[PDB]
Amino acid sequence: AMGSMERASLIQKAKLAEQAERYEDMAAFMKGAVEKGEELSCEERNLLSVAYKNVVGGQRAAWRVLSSIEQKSNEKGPEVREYREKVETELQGVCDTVLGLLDSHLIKEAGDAESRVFYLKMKGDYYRYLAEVATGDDKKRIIDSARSAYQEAMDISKKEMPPTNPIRLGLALNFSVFHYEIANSPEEAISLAKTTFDEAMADLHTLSEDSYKDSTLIMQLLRDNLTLWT
């Protein structure tokens, strides 16, 4: 389908799709671009992430709406359960597609510590989304996959990136969310967030006006999560 289209054209159309707020189209164009086998630039990595983030985001929001309506059973017909299952299956199919792309093309031993952390964080995020809806032995298996991916991304970031690096901050941010919401470890989540914030705060004076904007943006999200968790 996309195989007959030049890589550059696929990137142009993904940008068009984004302008038109056609994020499902945007994800299909980027998937095709990745499947060309060539590495993604920083710009192209973010196009990919933005595309599938919007797709799975809408599904997660819909799954949550339906799940709470379903949980309010005696504080009934099967329609709510059935439709929630439909959405769930669809959410899972998107996550599987992203994980399939990461394992098959994107996650590599080569490359800078920026691409490597980016993709490993992405793998953790989308196993986390899968964990949000799993249940049994499949769930533990999923949580282990998220943990393992976040940890390997974590190890690379703390060794090859300064504390204010935005990608390192966003990874730590999402890892702390993983602890609080998936692993059920609020102490670890709070500790990781506070540690990430304070260590970045101490190095903010070494940054330019642009870096200062990127770092503080994510740090405020750490602040928001902390004030809520404690």
Partner: peptide, 8 residues
């Protein structure tokens, strides 16, 4: 709710 990277 808990904010992640998706939340800008």
């Amino acid at each position: 709710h808990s904010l992640s990277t998706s939340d800008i």
